[PDB]
Design an enzyme around this catalytic site. Structure first.
Site: not given
Lengths: 339, 339, 339, 339
Positions: B290-291, B308, B143, B233
């Site tokens: 990390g979201h 998103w 993401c 990541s």
């Protein structure tokens, strides 16, 4: 007699109300203003005729959006609507069914023609002159393959493929070396309709994707799919013969041609099919093959619900034609599709 | 003090009106009724708090729809909103900025983490025990790679990659044999931002797909992406360092941590960024990394617009938190992102 | 009629003189004493026939040394010499051209099949039962890729790759998961022949290694290389078709089969080629594919200069066969190789 | 007093005879004609002094060839020979031991500093300004690591690593991010000297390469190797301490410095070592570190046999110096190396 921008736009809102509308840009044959398309920004769309002799609302959807870019089967339809709205200009008079909810939507079926559906179609080997390379890409499943598969998932049948199939790729195909023979061992298949999901997001595992890409590969061959960046088939005639002989569907499965019927009798045929929860294979004939899709519902107000085998975009209610009571696009369909 | 179904549902419509609403089903951490989500059927959605001590409208979108299934960065956020709505239950009182239109939407940028974006990520080699096989599938872009790449396309920069990168895949990674070293020759890149479209439908040629899949592959590496059926990541800290050192962005690019600021001073930072047409890399920290996502607009009424990196689903306006005037999810962001 | 150790050894020195000789140890098919090989210690080697009915000196080199261990293309040749020296035992009588200096040596071209040449070949994923693991190692470039590449460097052409290529790895291949499709975007290549050195010592930078490993990767694919700890290809037939269609060489590039010619007419073909400073792709056919190499010179005394694509070991002058005036090893070659 | 081309060339052939000679081209410091090098084409080389005050034959090898390009340790030696042949020009007079066969050659030991030896050295992460990138490449094992490992294989010891080691990469190292700590768990090693072959061709399996690459990684750390496209170490002083404390060799292992001895006594030290089948670690000190190699033989005529840890190129017999009976290059060595 002409209906122009502001007016069409108005006709839209009116139809809706009966809000912001962004006009859609189509080109090539859909250029001009014989027809107008406006995507409602909160959702949905409305397609408007640009000439009062033809009917006002040609197609709509409360939600989603409309678009034809790259989606040929969809464009092939709008083209007829157009080179039809023109045939109405020959007149001088102005323009003068039960309800079935989308059958496929009710089962959440929304297939496409790309990855992962096409995970097993032939890998393009050559570059078509004057076109960018798609070498190494998997051919597209083709629309008739897509229209057919959706209808098959809707009945989740067969469980066991019935008869094997084979064919030789058209020799004038630029994407493959020749000769090219493709073979599907349908007869040895155990289609697990629990693995063949009604729709994929692309994050599925190997079991789910393998399932569908394989369904799609077999159907595509069963209809002698001419594979490429895009893929075409004769359509109706291969589809009806395939469903019965290869996949074991009912003898009722057969083809009917728009030109053998009167508009009411033609509609009666489709309405009848929907009344039995039996989606309808439908297509428009062109050079490159059958510009197919699926009709799986009806608004009762003479609009039929279409699923263009593109994941949902452009899906909604359309008119079988813009004709005023007649180019039919050499239309045809495969009905009586059931186990 | 509780707000129940019927009530929430009402709160929704009221918000909208200020129609049909289908409630959305989330499970795991988002189970319960501390929060409610309704997808408006003609289009859009509204997320409602299930307890009057927390603010009423937590997020909304006039169009599109909401969904978290499989989209972890999106569920990771809703989770905080929840384990936060609870923290407001400690009180006994009831709940008590300019406008920027989505920067990314304004340039039609909507990336994903799958095909064809992930066309060049590592191909999964092993099966994680107790999980289905994704062997042979390409890892997901991850993401932060996606959130980063959208921001990069928005600026269409660099033209030339600045400095190469390399890293060793975490050794506890089950999808690959070890050791595994990944290398991106970024210093030798000539990013053609005409080939890296703002979005892909999947029918693009080899030139367009090659372009994007490669951008995504270099970014994912520059941030030490732990690749798999899903990819994670550290995020912010690699992202800020990567943008500057590898891709040549401005020294102003730097990381800021939610916990170093006061709610108004934290917002002031983001508002400032948007005022300058500079989207903001944003993320929520969790174990797996990390979201992340992108904040590229604001409704002026204290809602921020999020993308998103899923193609558009769940996109819309959200609140940075459900806190009543405090779990922040160890939030952080990379700002000052410009050439 | 037999020639034994002492005798052979003598034959060697005599040939040289016309010193210390260490006999070479070959096993498997090259076991026995139908043939002898002695490496001159100060440098060079001489391969001697072990039976007077066959010719005395089968091959030699003033310098370097001879060895076949692991070098299959080299052993495959020695094998024919042998199962040929035997065919001469059917008789009862005893045994009864301009000069071209190694074309390749003249340009210092000495490629191999390993690192760094194979820096971009497929990374082996599985273990072949009953063999040690090469998992994580890069496949070998394969010989025909090597033989082809040396000839290509000799002409430093093309500058631009002509047409892309793709193929599906043989399904019975044990080193990879299936299906496996390999793609080379040759059509988009800008071969920098200043970076593709004539030989690598392995201390090169990234620019030089990248160059070559990539050349080698495109050639290996263009010939449907079945990749593994070792790599094989049909050879001649893919090589001739690849050079022309994919890499843009002259229409003159074509395949010729040993069995279509008379010994003198077959030699005349090769001699002609060398007269034009045009190395010759040559191979011997076996199960596992074409045991290829390069003929780029001749001693004028009926010996041809071979380059085994092993860096130089075993290089020298050899006889096309040990036949007495006839197993040809299903030999063949690709000639007319020029821009 | 000068010896010119034609004369040197003659001196060569004379030495050999006591044929074709291609002169070798060295640049930088070895530019000029204070010394000459001719590779004998059938095999071998002879290095000639270019001034009669210095000794005539400085070094030779019946076989192989001589080269310094890129091989610093080898160039660092020739440099002293030169800035030494100059120190003899201070005079006005003209120039005025048992035999041990290469110890390492006798066991077929020929290591290098690249792949696969370096398969486990640090992967270079940064580009040194004004140099091409080697990012993603594995550092070189370094020469002292190589000289040391060859001596270790010669004794195939230890079987069990004795003591772990750790060190911090020099902070002025441009190829790595700082800080960088490297660690070898030597204490937990079970060196299988059956897997650590005396030489690799590059086609070995995973077991063989893993073996050696790991021996090389531990030695390199034990001597605080400053890793990069090339790798240097203090040498002697780390080597002697490492062999005893980390790898468990004999207390006899110790360092000796050229400057603490008289030429005959210094030689006596080396000769003694060789008389006991104990190769000698040797090096010449320079800024960048110890320019090491291995002395493992002698021609009895005052020439010592050197192995430059480069696979064999330039190996042969050399003179400890060109001095006329004195720059010693800050020479030194580690002797008494035995289990």
């Amino acid at each position: 007699f002409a209906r122009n921008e502001k007016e069409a736009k108005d006709s839209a809102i009116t139809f809706i109300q009966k809000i912001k509308l962004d006009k859609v840009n189509l080109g090539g044959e859909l250029s001009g203003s014989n027809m107008y398309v406006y995507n409602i920004s909160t959702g949905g769309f409305v397609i408007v005729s640009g000439d009062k002799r033809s009917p006002e609302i040609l197609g709509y959807s409360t939600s989603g959006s409309f678009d034809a870019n790259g989606k040929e089967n969809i464009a092939s339809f709008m083209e007829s609507y157009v080179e039809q709205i023109k045939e109405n200009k020959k007149l001088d008079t102005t323009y003068a069914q039960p309800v079935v909810k989308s059958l496929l939507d009710s089962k959440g079926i929304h297939y496409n023609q790309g990855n992962p559906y096409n995970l097993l179609t032939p890998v393009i080997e050559k570059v078509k002159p004057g076109e960018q390379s798609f070498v190494g890409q998997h051919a597209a499943t083709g629309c008739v393959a897509t229209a057919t598969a959706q209808i098959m998932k809707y009945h989740n049948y067969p469980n066991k493929g019935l008869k094997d199939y084979t064919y030789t790729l058209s020799s004038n195909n630029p994407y493959f070396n020749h000769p090219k023979n493709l073979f599907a061992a349908i007869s040895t298949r155990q289609y697990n309709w629990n693995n063949i999901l009604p729709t994929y997001s692309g994050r599925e595992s190997n079991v789910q994707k393998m399932a569908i890409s394989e369904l799609m590969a077999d159907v595509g061959i069963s209809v002698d799919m001419d594979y490429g960046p895009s893929s075409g088939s004769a359509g109706s005639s291969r589809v009806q013969r395939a469903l019965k002989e290869n996949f074991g569907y009912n003898q009722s499965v057969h083809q009917i041609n728009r030109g053998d019927f009167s508009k009411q009798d033609w509609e009666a045929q489709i309405d009848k099919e929907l009344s039995q929860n039996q989606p309808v294979y439908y297509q428009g004939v062109g050079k490159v093959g059958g510009h197919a899709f699926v009709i799986d519902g009806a608004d009762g107000r003479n609009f039929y619900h279409v699923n263009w085998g593109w994941g949902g975009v452009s899906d909604g209610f359309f008119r079988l034609d813009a004709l005023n009571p007649g180019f039919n696009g050499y239309q045809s369909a495969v009905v009586g599709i059931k186990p």
